[PDB]
Amino acid sequence: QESVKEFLAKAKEEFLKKWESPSQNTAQLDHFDRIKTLGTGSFGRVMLVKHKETGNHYAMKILDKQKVVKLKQIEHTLNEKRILQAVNFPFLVKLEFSFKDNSNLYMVMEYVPGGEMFSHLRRIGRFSEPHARFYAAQIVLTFEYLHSLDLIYRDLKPENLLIDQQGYIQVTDFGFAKRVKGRTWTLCGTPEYLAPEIILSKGYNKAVDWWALGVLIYEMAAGYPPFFADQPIQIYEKIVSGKVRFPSHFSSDLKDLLRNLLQVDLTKRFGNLKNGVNDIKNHKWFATTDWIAIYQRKVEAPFIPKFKGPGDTSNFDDYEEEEIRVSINEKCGKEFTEF
Numbered sequence: 489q490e491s492v493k494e495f496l497a498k499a500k501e502e503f504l505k506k507w508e509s510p511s512q513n514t515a516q517l518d519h520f521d522r523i524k525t526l527g528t529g530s531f532g533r534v535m536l537v538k539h540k541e542t543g544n545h546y547a548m549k550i551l552d553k554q555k556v557v558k559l560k561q562i563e564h565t566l567n568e569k570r571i572l573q574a575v576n577f578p579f580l581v582k583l584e585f586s587f588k589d590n591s592n593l594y595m596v597m598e599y600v601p602g603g604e605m606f607s608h609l610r611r612i613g614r615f616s617e618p619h620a621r622f623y624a625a626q627i628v629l630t631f632e633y634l635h636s637l638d639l640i641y642r643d644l645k646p647e648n649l650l651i652d653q654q655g656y657i658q659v660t661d662f663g664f665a666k667r668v669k670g671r672t673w674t675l676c677g678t679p680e681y682l683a684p685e686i687i688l689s690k691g692y693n694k695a696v697d698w699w700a701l702g703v704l705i706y707e708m709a710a711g712y713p714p715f716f717a718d719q720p721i722q723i724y725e726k727i728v729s730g731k732v733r734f735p736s737h738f739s740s741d742l743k744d745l746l747r748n749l750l751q752v753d754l755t756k757r758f759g760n761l762k763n764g765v766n767d768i769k770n771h772k773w774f775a776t777t778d779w780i781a782i783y784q785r786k787v788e789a790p791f792i793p794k795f796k797g798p799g800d801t802s803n804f805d806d807y808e809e810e811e812i813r814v815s816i817n818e819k820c821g822k823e824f825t826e827f
């Protein structure tokens with residue numbers, strides 16, 4: 489399809505230019521006012537901030553350099569920043585500024601006020617198949633783009649997908665993404681979404697992102713993921729068996745797609761065969777999908793989140809508010825020279 493070949497050829501040209509010449513130190517902390525904590529992890533936090541000169545709102549990710557080294561995430565945090573300053577796609581969150589100081593690394597992204605897809609899924613119960621299909625088509629197009637750049641994403645799940653002001657998806661949380669020619673080996677991701685070859689400590693490739701799409705479409709349509717248990721070891725046993733049971737309300741076309749995405753043998757899995765992503769785009773479950781209209785954002789979305797303005801935080805949840813302290817001395821300077 490010529491218009492798709494030329495689109496992706498140009499996409500890769502523009503990605504490589506920025507990849508080979510990354511930007512650095514494009515703002516500083518006292519250019520912003522702090523508003524609220526939006527999310528936390530074992531080495532970082534995300535805060536809503538407002539730029540003092542322009543008044544624009546942003547999601548500022550703050551990573552603690554000393555905890556990054558301890559949790560062994562140095563290369564991952566350098567992957568994340570380099571990838572985010574080089575990509576450009578309608579359904580990816582854009583990096584606007586980055587900088588560092590004596591204690592922390594900072595990535596400043598556009599703020600999306602609609603909240604995480606996870607919150608909306610749990611409030612509604614499950615998404616109808618047309619509603620799940622609209623979100624899934626945006627993930628297929630985003631993976632077609634990323635994989636053509638030799639990037640793997642490695643953390644697809646509903647908590648990492650935001651719903652925007654037009655009801656469309658924005659993928660965020662690029663902390664495990666990596667540029668990969670061939671195979672890679674790091675153990676990372678979230679237990680319920682891991683493909684069997686990751687659990688078995690094998691060299692793996694972009695097929696793990698297509699497995700995770702199968703898990704996501706099942707979770708959107710059922711209300712719960714296909715493999716669950718109280719301990720990760722029990723989750724892993726179910727995954728590598730891959731025996732999966734489908735609710736009776738699933739359509740026959742949906743069950744067929746999911747059996748081909750949740751294929752335990754990676755050499756048989758849709759998205760990893762000779763025809764690549766087109767085995768997915770041409771599947772009967774997507775027969776009603778206008779792929780061009782979705783990319784151009786001309787389709788009316790299933791619902792628009794309720795929010796009052798660009799600074800509204802009502803769709804995110806409440807976290808303890810702690811300080812952003814910067815040490816008087818520099819920490820881990822050498823390890824993050826390239827950030």
Ligand SMILES: N[C@H]1[C@H](O)[C@@H](N2CCOCC2)[C@@H]2OC[C@H]1O2
Nearest residue numbers: 753754755756757760761762763
């Ligand atoms: N070639 C072998 C593969 O494991 C399968 N193929 C994967 C590539 O695409 C189509 C089918 C199928 O099962 C046995 C044989 O044919």
